[PDB]
């Protein structure tokens, strides 16, 4: 029964009880209203009660008509009383490890399966039931106010559909997609994903390079883990630093600090192992590998 | 050299078979309907069940040099690894973990190298919320088309760097190769300290242009 | 709704009611707390009640906000107030008959399907929902303290995986497995199973030995059924018995007791039809067939 | 929770409340018992109530521990205070028309589908949920006390399994089975069905005989319908009639009555169009076609 109808029914009982007690027993409107609540809630203090046969009969009628109505009303009332975030579309193993690495941030999960809510709520993320390809269910999960949306659906067609729905909602949010097949990388970039992470291509190239000796797979799976002594972090060159215009050959960052400068990125372009006459700017993102003491020393070296 | 056996068929083994053009590959899988897509990649197809020791001994595991095990689930991968270790106890096994919990079980069961793609994908997803230079680095250093290549260069016996520390060797200014790790045996030391003295038999893992790779090979030559 | 949240909500109602009655009606904090419980539980003794219009209005608000909250709280409270075990991994026919014979003990059935819950609880076992290959879902089902774990899963690879998981958890528990194929008996024993039972090998050998006349299948399926007259019993030799150091030729069990000595066991080995020079020891297990009167005569025969 | 455990729990609450009120508030054991019931039932007359702070605290504890316990107890108590038939196994169209023709008799329906209960209860038959091949579900539907069991399952293997289950329960009941394929008629008779009705063989032979002109299909579908003027009924020859030893050539039943004697059956054998020297007996079942006036005339002619 709609909650609003139950509201009207309980109000009608309240009017009936209050008017009846007032007219039959002669108590004030306020006392009569109070007595009606006390009676239909089954509290029954007995500070007020009928003293006439008509009042006794009336009270039995109010008991029968009112107690059930009030009970249903209170239970319905119960129901109504009782940087930014990251939205994850779909539930897989890749999103499971991403949600493991995303502790401390607010994470929504938009998935179709209802029987994953226990593992989503145990991993530390709010679960939003829905279809990620539909714009209304995409919208509910707060895609507008997010800072990044991570799309990992069952196929590449559904992933492209989800990316186009998110681009219909917000044209400025960041989309991180996952390619299940190799040839759909450029199509997932055409749809609007800001970065496409193809795990089976990385896995196949590591399994191909691990025939002779597997040092490349050890390097990748060790520096991506936040458990080793060396960590891959990106330091930015601040506005007004000592390094503007200075090339990497004049800098010798590995000589003065001890971090390994493996790449310098600007915008959305990265040049791995840059040549010696590459002139630094303000805003270039330095990608390096070193211990956190060396990382703090590198931050103190490139300071303003 | 010898052949390479691939047990099971998926996308990981498909890209691994693409990167193994020029070599001999036996593919062992239950599906008969993959014979064209195996055979168009230059691989000899062998029908069978990879978990069974008879269908394993069909596909020449004894004479192989490396076995790549990527089956449909992780229990099947551990069963097939046990079936391989029944036959040849010293062949190199490269597995693939579909779950993070099963890596120590796949290494206890006998796999020399366990490569878990979903853990790498989750860690590259979570680190690309701000900007994805790490995922760009990982996905661009592995492709065999780019300008810079990650290579393994062995140190020969009688070289010029026996006992020489990495500070006095001065690899980056002389050659141009970024030295990200020096490996030995079954350990890899990423960013080795300045007191690290080399040994004849170490593996230098580096990144550089192929001219710098030739200069590094001519620089460490005996 | 989580039980702890309901706890907070009812506490908030209690604070609201107690403070309100104290300030509006002027009763002590203790009386006000008592009145609040009496009211929101709908007991309503009427020893205390509001005597002012404001108190009457306040009481109606407490009735509406508090009665439902208290009702939900008490029902949630209800739930918390209201040898060793055996774990069975997987649900099939073999584990069903094993559960039929294992009445009286505590059995935890770990299974992937949720629809097997009613038949597991009707067979007399506590159902634990989970995946038997996962290590955490094994540790949920109390594998650490059990005295035997029975593994029978869908395939043989899943059985080897569950055995490896149990051996990662506990290195002392007894594992009984079921092999689907003849080739995997040695792999299941290497992976750590204390006993491997292969039903299809027994069935194939009985079907091949039942061509001429099937007395072998009748013998096996009659001595294993605990409804016949004869039972296959294991009778252990105690320390200090009369038979330490006698041969089985000189002991002469069958004519003096009535049992049939088909085999003797020690540790993890079994000697079927032991030769006459076999000298008995202490701690040996005697495997025999006989009527229970003969079994008790053999038990009194081997006493200290 | 077992009803008896709930009983113990409520008794324990009653002891707790009664002893507490007696010792803390000093009322008699009888008054204390009465107060405890009045309180945990939430009646709360207020003729007795605590007057000490300890009594107030105790009463709040009794309210919390007792109201839920009493509520669960009363609801459990509620539960304890508050020719032959024809069993049909399976639900099809043939059983639907059979259930249409079986009005006025008590019909059970044993079927696996839960979402047929509305049409079974609308057709006038009690629905028994279950698997017809299982002996326990066969048993529940009262196969023992039935007079006929009608088996119409999805295939012939399930039909034979159901027939063998019914023959395991009762070896004297009547089984009417339906063959889905032609070659399984003798196997459905071997399993134990008393009569096998193969509808697709009848339909195929009528569709084969209806090429030229369809008088045979009109005859069959008209005399089987209880709507025409002529009806196919079986009259039995009573013990001690005028027709014993008299042949059909000496009888001339069609001359004296007007029914068409198309067959005479004994036991489970029927001879269609019997020859002239066929001697009648007592117990032979006459199969004829005629108007009900001719049927009553035939009953009056063969009387004792």
From Swiss-Prot, chain B:
Domain RCK N-terminal residues, every copy: 1-116
Cellular component, GO annotation: plasma membrane
One Gene Ontology term from the biological process aspect of the record: potassium ion transport
Domain of life: Archaea
Domain RCK C-terminal: 138-222
Localization per record: Cell membrane
Positions that bind Ca(2+): 70, 96, 98
Membrane-topology annotation of the record: Multi-pass membrane protein
Protein name as catalogued: Calcium-gated potassium channel MthK
Organism from which the protein derives: Methanothermobacter thermautotrophicus (strain ATCC 29096 / DSM 1053 / JCM 10044 / NBRC 100330 / Delta H) (Methanobacterium thermoautotrophicum)
Lineage summary: Archaea, Methanobacteriati, Methanobacteriota, Methanomada group, Methanobacteria
Gene of this entry: mthK
């Amino acid at each position: 029964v709609p909650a609003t109808r139950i509201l009207l029914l309980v109000l009608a009982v309240i009017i009936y009880g209050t008017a009846g007690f007032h007219f039959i027993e002669g108590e004030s409107w306020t006392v009569s209203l109070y007595w009606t609540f006390v009676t239909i809630a089954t509290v029954g203090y007995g500070d007020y009660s009928p003293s006439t046969p008509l009042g006794m009969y009336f009270t039995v009628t109010l008991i029968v008509l009112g107690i059930g109505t009030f009970a249903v009303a209170v239970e319905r009332l119960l129901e109504f009383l009782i940087s930014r975030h990251v939205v994850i579309c779909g539930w897989s193993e890749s999103t499971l490890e991403c949600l493991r690495e995303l502790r401390g941030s607010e994470v929504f999960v938009l998935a179709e399966d209802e029987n994953v809510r226990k593992k989503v709520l145990r991993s530390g993320a709010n679960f939003v039931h829905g279809d990620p390809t539909r714009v209304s269910d995409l919208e509910k999960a707060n895609v507008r106010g997010a800072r990044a949306v991570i799309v990992d659906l069952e196929s590449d067609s559904e992933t492209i559909h989800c990316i186009l729905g998110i681009r219909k909602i917000d044209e400025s949010v960041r989309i991180i997609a996952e390619a299940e097949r190799y040839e759909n990388i450029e199509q997932l970039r055409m749809a609007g994903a800001d970065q496409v992470i193809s795990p089976f291509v990385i896995s196949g190239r590591l399994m191909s390079r691990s025939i002779d000796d597997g040092y490349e797979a050890m390097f990748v799976q060790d520096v991506l883990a936040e458990e080793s002594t060396r960590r891959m972090v990106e330091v930015p060159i601040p506005e007004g630093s000592k390094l503007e215009g200075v090339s990497v050959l004049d800098a010798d960052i590995h000589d003065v600090t001890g971090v390994i400068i493996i790449g310098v990125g600007r915008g959305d372009e990265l040049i791995i192992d840059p040549p010696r006459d590459y002139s630094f700017r303000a805003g270039d993102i330095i990608l390096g590998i070193g211990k956190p003491e060396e990382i703090e020393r590198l931050k103190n070296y490139i300071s303003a």
